[PDB]
Structures are given as structure tokens and as C-alpha cells.
Design an enzyme around this catalytic site. Sequence first.
Site, PDB file in Angstrom:
ATOM      1  N   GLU A  27       0.909  -1.229  -0.061  1.00 25.19           N
ATOM      2  CA  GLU A  27      -0.033  -0.047   0.212  1.00 25.19           C
ATOM      3  C   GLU A  27       0.786   1.259  -0.076  1.00 25.19           C
ATOM      4  OE1 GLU A  27      -1.912  -0.898   3.607  1.00 25.19           O
ATOM      5  OE2 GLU A  27      -1.369   1.167   4.737  1.00 25.19           O
ATOM      6  N   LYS A 159      -5.021  -2.712  13.766  1.00 26.50           N
ATOM      7  CA  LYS A 159      -4.381  -1.791  14.403  1.00 26.50           C
ATOM      8  C   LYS A 159      -4.875  -1.766  15.863  1.00 26.50           C
ATOM      9  CE  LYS A 159      -2.779   0.910  10.610  1.00 26.50           C
ATOM     10  NZ  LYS A 159      -3.310   0.443   9.403  1.00 26.50           N
TER      11      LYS A 159
END
EC number: 4.2.1.70
Lengths: 304, 302, 304
Positions: A27, A159
Amino acid sequence: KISPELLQISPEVQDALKNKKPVVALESTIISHFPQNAQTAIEVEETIRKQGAVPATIAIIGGVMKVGLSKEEIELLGREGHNVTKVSRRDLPFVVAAGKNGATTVASTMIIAALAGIKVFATGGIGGVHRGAEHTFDISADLQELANTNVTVVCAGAKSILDLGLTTEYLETFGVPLIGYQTKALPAFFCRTSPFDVSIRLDSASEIARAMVVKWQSGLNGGLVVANPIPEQFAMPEHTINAAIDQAVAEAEAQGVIGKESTPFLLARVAELTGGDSLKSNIQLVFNNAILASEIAKEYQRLA
Amino acid sequence: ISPELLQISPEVQDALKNKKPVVALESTIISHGMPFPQNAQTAIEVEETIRKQGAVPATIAIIGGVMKVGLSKEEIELLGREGHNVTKVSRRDLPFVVAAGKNGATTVASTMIIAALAGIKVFATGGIGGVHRGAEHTFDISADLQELANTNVTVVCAGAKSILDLGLTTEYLETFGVPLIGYQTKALPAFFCRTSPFDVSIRLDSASEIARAMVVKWQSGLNGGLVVANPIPEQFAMPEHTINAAIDQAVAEAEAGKESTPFLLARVAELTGGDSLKSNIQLVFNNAILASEIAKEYQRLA
Amino acid sequence: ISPELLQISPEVQDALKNKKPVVALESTIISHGMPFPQNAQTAIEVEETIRKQGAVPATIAIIGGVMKVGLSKEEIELLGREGHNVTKVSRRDLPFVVAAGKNGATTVASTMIIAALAGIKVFATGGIGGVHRGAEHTFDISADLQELANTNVTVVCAGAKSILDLGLTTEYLETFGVPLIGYQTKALPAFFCRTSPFDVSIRLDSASEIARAMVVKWQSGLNGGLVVANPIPEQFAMPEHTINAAIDQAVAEAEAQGVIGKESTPFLLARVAELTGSLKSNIQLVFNNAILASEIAKEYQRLA
Ligand SMILES: [Mn+2]
Ligand SMILES: [Mn+2]
Ligand SMILES: [Mn+2]
């Protein structure tokens, strides 16, 4: 068969895919959000190369969805910096239409990887269900992309600024495998462990690749999360990182931080509260994930 | 799809190729049913019941890493014998059990998946999963609901257990565009009980009308499944007032996570004297009959 | 799809064949909007507004069990006379109304479905359904949002119907990857009011830009619809405080009477209308949306 005006795959990457060489997508929302970001992206790529795979960093450059980026494009995103749009699934058509540059989230990187036929994608951590989402409905589009798009995402888990319990429930409802690599406990991103457990533990890249093959040959569409614990030597002490995250979350709520800005705000604050340590941990976990991703890509190309 | 991944038994193969009505069955009834050799015998009897109705049963399971549509006697016996040592297989579990060559019992979702791969449109079961009480804060929501949203199979069941949150479940189904058909009922039945405080989305009184709607639905491209909520026969039914009394009591007592649902199951069992396993067997026979009818009519209409 | 299931009117068939821009319209506003003859008069006036803009209207409904794309004057009058006798038809209703030979008024969701079956990419309505107030505990969430997630139609609206929870609705759309375009606005318009405390996903100032983004979105394989939120004209806008008062009352009471289901929107709009005692504004925002939709359809057809 998408127009070359919309999508361009680099010569090396086309070459690699034709020859059935292992390719690992990356990404760009990590590179945006200098000239450190660039150098670092380039050495994640070189880490993949040293693992015997071919990196393909994905981004939107001048309105074109690009798979594999020149060092010059990488640079470009690096220096344009915070001026670069964070691009999710709902942003993607508009950045392409408008001829702009954009940095891709987990979701849009999955989308573009799948257009290019790339099955393995290395990242830091996935988005997920935000704390408080029971009353805010703030749920990352990443989870729906995982529900629907055929890409294995190798991460340090979700996360840890998120609500990990709700995230695991959500993944289950939508039928997305959550694989612990050599771990039963779901890795905490900055930490190796958490109170929650993956859906299956697998100990080898080979098993993961075999499962990918079976899953997609059986027509069960959607992606796989491979949660890969950060190396112990780089992990944050649970108490410290938890205090920092908790304070950051509380401040984000108090300050009305919402939407796409939440994650970058939280990560930036946590870096502030830990004195840059959480960031060092983040870097280490991304290298770690690139290595694992490379192995899975090799074994997947072997088994298919 | 490869024969190494998926195998359809000769009987079911013949039924499909000749356009005879086929009804899918899940295998968790065998592994999680009565102590062997009864669970096996029972599964065999349900299959026989489907045959007597003029349909071809296909019991679905994973045997040694192969998804199997229709089973032999010895496969069924094997699942029965292995009993609780057999893992329940959800959508997210499927690839791994198959990859690893394991045996497994298919759930509502996985059975819908495999049936759909086989081209089977009708699936008889006891009940479906749903939204759990407290899901508003726990997010605990059965993957069966998403399977229903996406996979074109009609699941003939007694609805979902009243131990789940039925209000939230009915809302969820509406949001995802899934028909909830009462078979000769407006009230939504739940497991033990013929009725409940909630309604189905539409009442239909015949297998043929359900089939006709399935045909319109899928010819119009509206993908996804259908719930046919079929009340448990009166003979085996339990009064809604007693069941509700028991649940409200058990939920009041639970008040003072993952232990919530089965705690409620066990407690309600104790209070009402209701027996989950026996009731479920009854449900499966009943639904197997209705499902055979729907399958016959669908075969006629498509 | 069989002519027994779906029939396209000669005007609309002609348009599609000759590549003229077509704008879909819903029938639920006709049956459940207001009394006859006024309801049918207004429906026909909306069709005429589209024609005046140089596009071709296709009012959609189910008549005698057939999904009809484009209606005769007679049929619109039928739906107008029948009014609330006519079933409101959602995605889960559609198969049964068709099978049973029944008349029905299509919701935003069902209108999108039928439009898409006919190759119609632009649909003008008043407001979309959304997440209901209290949905965090009731799960009452319009199937319109799922249809937007999945069906390839641009829906031009004044935002969500404003008796809803706009915060939760915007988060939901983001999770499911649905563009929320503000037409010449960053603030999300709320039905009767031009503004709200919430934002759209992107502001676009021209129908041309919207069309180009549609083409890019669908050519890139990102299936799903687009919401175009078009603020009600200033002359017809209602003051935030007054309208907010009425809506507040109507919601609190809907919770008091305990209406929960598909009858919620009709009941709400009813009560609020009563306290207003709003209808002028509703009619005018629909005309405004029909005009913008006609422009979007022209620009899109131009590209397609
Ligand atoms: Mn978010
Ligand atoms: Mn669960
Ligand atoms: Mn509703």
C-alpha cells in the site's frame, strides 16, 4: 480487461505475473501520511526482493491506478506528502477521474491488487471496528473489502487503536478467515499478544497458501487476514503502549476527530506519547510482514 | 470445481442430472446428535423420510478433506462415531478443514454453500443462527445471516431459537433483503414454540407458492436465500408463555459474554423441561417433509 | 429476463434503443405521498420536468404483478387512486408481489433494482432511507443502504430523509464503500434543510464530473451505487430550528406509539407534515432532483 487509461502494471510486474513469479503488493498510505518515507518504502521493496519475491507498490499517480511504481513516483508521493488524498473504495473513482495522485488504504490496495491478479499484500495493520462503534457505527471499509475481495493481507493483526473484540466478531459474521501465524492469540500490532484469539492458527506459509488455493477454487470469495506477531525484540511493553493508546483515543473523542482522519491522528499521537517508539515498532512489524508475505507468495505460486 | 475438492454421490448425481427434486441436509445433526449409534440411525431415517416423500436427500459433510454432497452409510456412521470430536465447519473454517484433509460437520452456512455449489436449492434443518442478545454491544451475529443474504438456497427451519434476539434478527434480515416466509403462519415460530412476539415478512400456505416465489426471485436476479419458518408440530410444541417466562427468568439471572447464549439454553432447558435434542430431531423430520414438497414444486416450476 | 416479469414502455424502449438519457422515478411517493388527484398530477409533472430538461422519464412500479419501467398516465392514476391500498415493495417483498399478480409501489431499493435490470443508471427521488434514530439498539436500518452498496445506479436525492440518524447513515455508507457526492456542497443537506452538521464524501460542482466518476467507478469493477445529495433550492428551504422541532416531536412520539418497521417512514413524514403543517418543500426538492438527475443522465449517456 480494464482500459490502460485507468490501470497500468509495471513491466517488471507484468513480466513476473506472466512467468508465475511471486509478487507481493504494498500500500501507499504508509508512504504518505520525506525523504524518509520514500527510502523506507524502497527498502520494504528491497526486503521483498531479498526474500526472492517481486514487490509491487500500488498507488494512484496522475489519475492512473499503478501497480509497481518507479522510484520517481515513490519519491513523488513521498514529497507531495500530506497533500496526497487518502484513497478508500469510495474515493477511488474520483481521484482517478480527476487525474490526481492518491495513496491507497488497505481496502483500495486490495481492490487494485485483485485487478492485477496479485493474491498477496503486505501491510502494517488492518483497519477494523473503532472503539465506541457500538454507538458511532465507525467501522473500517477494510473489513468489507476483506469480506468481498480475493486477497491475502499479511499484517500485525488489526491496528491496536481499534476495538479488537468487535473486530473479531465482525470478521466472523462476514466469514473472513483470521489466521494466526504461529500464534493462537491475535497479535496486538505493537504487541505480540492480546486478549483475543484468531480463527485458526497455522504454522507455515505452505499451509496458508494451500488454504488460499482451496478457498478460491471453492468459490468462497473474500480475503484472508494473516496476523503475524511483531518480533519480540521490537514489541512495545503492554502497559506503556496501552496507556498511550488509551489517552490518544480519549483525546480523539474529546476533539471530535472522526472518519478517515481518526487512524492517522491516533497513530501520530501514540508516536508522540511513546517518544517515537511506537513508530519504530510499526516499521519493524512492516518488514516482518513483508518477509512472511514473500514466503506465502512463493508457496502460493508453487501450489498454483 | 475439482473432484478432489468436491464430490457428489452417485444417487444425488443421478437426481440432479435427471431433474429429480433434491433436499440438502446438514451433518452437525449427526456429530452433535444422540449418542451413537442413534445419531447415525436418525440421520438415516431423515434421509429415508425424504425418499418416501419422493425426493432425493443429500446429506452434506466434509470427509477426509473432501466436501461431500450426499453420503454413504459408512460416512454417516463415521461422523456419528467420531461424534463430538468432529469440528463444526463455518464459512471461514471450510478452506482449512478441506486443505488439511480433516473430517467436519457442516453448519447452516457451510451446508448452504456446498449445496449451492451442487446446484441444490432447498435445505432442511432444525433452526438458523441469528443476532444474539446483547449483540448491540457485543456484535455477536451469526454468519448464517450473511449466508442467507448471499447464497441462493431456501432454508426450511423452525426459525431461530427464542434465546437469540428475534427482534434484531428480523430487522437484520429486512436490511439484507432476505424473505422470511411463515409456512401457514403470520407469527414467527421459534424452535420449541409455534409462535413468538414477532412476525414473518410474508405468510404462504403452500409448498407450490414458496416455489413460485423462489422462481420469480432468482429469475429477477435477486440473489440470496429465503427463510421458510415452519412451526414445530403441535404434538411436540411448547407453550409460548412458558418458554418466554423461562427465558425472561434466565436472562434476569444471567444479568447477575461468550457464556451468555449457552447459559440461557441450559437454564431454559432446566426450567421448562424442554429437550433441545429431541425437539430438534422432530423439527428436522417435519422440515424435511415440507422441504421435499418445496423441492418437488420448484423442480416443476423451473 | 422474461417479458412476463419485466416490461419496458415504448417511450423508454425507444429512448434506450436510441441512446437517449433516461431518468428513473419511484412509485412510492405516488401512492404514499399525498391524496388523489394531486398525487398523480404531481407524478406527471415530475415526468414533464424531466422531458423539459431533454431527458426521458421512466416511472417504475409493479402493476398486475409485472415490473414496469415507464408507466402510462392510466397506471400512474391507478397507483394514485389506490394510494395506501398499494403495498410498499422492498427487495424482500418483490418476488411475492410479482408472483401474486399484485400492484405495488417501489421503494428506493426496489426502484434501483428494476432500473438496473433495464440498464437505467440514474434515478431521481426525494430522499434515501438510512439508519434510523435508535438503530444502535434496534438495528432498524433501511435496505436502501444495502442496495446502494450493491446495485449500479446513481440516486439523486436531497440527502437522507431527515427523520433519520444522519451520523450513523454517513458512517454506514463509508463502511460499504458508497460515494456520497455533495452537489456544490460539502455539508450534507438534510432534506428540508440545505445544511447539517455532517459532511459528504466528496463535493462535486458539475453533472459532468459526476458522470465521468460513474463511468470510471463501474469500468473499474467497483459495483454499487452513488448517492448525489442535492440541497433543496433556497426559496423552499426550511429553517433548521423549526423543522428540527417538528421532526423531534414526530420521532419522540413514533417511539411513544412504538411504530417499528416499514411503517416508520410513512408514519413519521405523516406526523411531521401535520406539525408543519413541508409538503411544498418536499415536492420542490423532488423537482430539483429531477432536474439535476436529467443533467447527470445526459452527461453519462454522452460518455456511455
Ligand atoms: Mn472510519
Ligand atoms: Mn457468534
Ligand atoms: Mn426499517
